[PDB]
Amino acid sequence: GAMGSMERASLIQKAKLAEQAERYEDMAAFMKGAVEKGEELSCEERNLLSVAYKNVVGGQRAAWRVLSSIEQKSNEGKGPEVREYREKVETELQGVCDTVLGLLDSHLIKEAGDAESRVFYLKMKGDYYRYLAEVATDDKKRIIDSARSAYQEAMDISKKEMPPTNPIRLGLALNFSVFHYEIANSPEEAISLAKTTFDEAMADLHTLSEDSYKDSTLIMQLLRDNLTLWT
């Protein structure tokens, strides 16, 4: 529980209903319950897990950035309320990251043998350590290196086992490049990774169906957008 008494199929069905209703907290709770049934997740189910928690922590991060900005302005010679409330949101955010990292560690990653499932989960692990790094203040260094390590393992597998146009490989590369730029203070590594990823994908588009082409080029455009921003 609290999802322990519901059928796995019903949890998945309700996660999809929650997505339609834009009820992402519910969606995440349903997907947590589905994961905790102990069976591996399908491709579509992995996407549902990603969508649910990404939206939840997305709201929390946006709120945290608002409050952090206000707190920063408050400094530079009122009361403790701004800091308290930022800490409240921060704690809640960390709790969600810890929850997702918990699911990945118990036991999604260890049972994921196929390249695309394994890369998917390791990319997710990198992301949630990155979100923890965004608010960390030297616990921070170990957090950053945990993000790096997860991204790196995912990169190694994806380069060996997936085509350069694979959307999971592309999405991993885009986020690892964002990690380099935003977290690791390595803009040159960020730019290099983004460019090589984009160029290697470009060269492989000719192999793709119209639908696969659409999928890949969409993410390539986001890579390009970041490069334009960075240079």
Binding site: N47, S50, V51, K54, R65, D127, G171, L174, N175, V178, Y181, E182, I219, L222, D225, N226, L229, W230
Partner: peptide, 7 residues
Amino acid sequence: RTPSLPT
């Protein structure tokens, strides 16, 4: 904030 990958 550099945009990360949506979804």
